[PDB]
C-alpha cells in the first residue's frame, strides 16, 4: 500500500545523484575578528586624534588570509589566535578523498604535502631534462 511508485519517484532516484557544488567555506573567526586589528598598536596623534602612520607596524604585521579578503594584516603579537585559519588556507580546498591520487602513489614525492596542500612541486619538462643532462655530457 506503499505510495508514489510513479515517475517522481523515478526521477528523484536518478537526478539526486547529481553532485552539488562544493566550496570549501572555511571556518569563520567570529570571536576574533581579524580585520578589526588593523587598529592595534597605533600611535594616536594628539592633533587629528587618529592613528599615526606607523611605518614599522606593517613589518610586525602577520597577514592572516581570508576568503572575502585577500590577506587581512594583524600585528605579530596577535597572530596565534588565528592558528586554524592559517592551517585552513594552506590546506587544499577539497576533501582529500578526491585528491587521494597524490597521497598513495609515487606522487608522495612529487608533491608538496605540507599541511595538506597537495600542490605539485617544481618539475622540469622533457625539453629540459635533456637540456640539463646533455649540457653536462652525462
Amino acid at each position: 500500500f506503499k505510495q508514489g511508485q510513479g515517475m517522481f519517484s523515478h526521477q528523484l532516484k536518478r537526478i539526486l545523484n547529481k553532485k552539488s557544488l562544493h566550496k570549501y567555506n572555511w571556518d569563520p573567526l567570529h570571536m576574533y575578528d581579524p580585520r578589526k586589528l588593523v587598529h592595534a598598536n597605533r600611535y594616536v596623534d594628539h592633533d587629528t586624534y587618529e592613528e599615526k602612520y606607523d611605518p614599522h607596524w606593517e613589518h610586525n604585521a602577520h597577514l592572516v588570509p581570508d576568503q572575502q579578503f585577500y590577506n587581512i594584516p594583524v600585528p605579530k603579537e596577535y597572530k596565534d589566535a588565528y592558528w586554524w585559519r592559517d592551517l585552513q588556507a594552506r590546506r587544499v580546498q577539497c576533501p582529500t578523498e578526491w585528491v587521494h591520487f597524490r597521497m598513495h602513489t609515487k606522487d608522495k614525492l612529487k608533491y608538496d604535502f605540507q599541511d595538506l596542500a597537495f600542490r605539485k612541486k617544481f618539475e622540469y619538462s622533457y625539453e629540459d631534462v635533456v637540456a640539463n643532462a646533455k649540457d653536462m655530457c652525462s
Partner: protein, 48 residues
Amino acid sequence: DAKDGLAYVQSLSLTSIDGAAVLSVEEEFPAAAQPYAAVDPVYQEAVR
C-alpha cells in the same frame, strides 16, 4: 623611519663593509606622491 636618512648615512662616511668599498650613497625618495590610499586601512581594505 625618519626624514634624516641621506644626511645621516653619510655622517658615518662609509668606505667599506669588509668587502664593500661603497660606490654611491644616492637617495631613492620612493615616498614621492604616495597616495594616502597606501596607508589608509579603510581604503587598502577596499582594494584587498
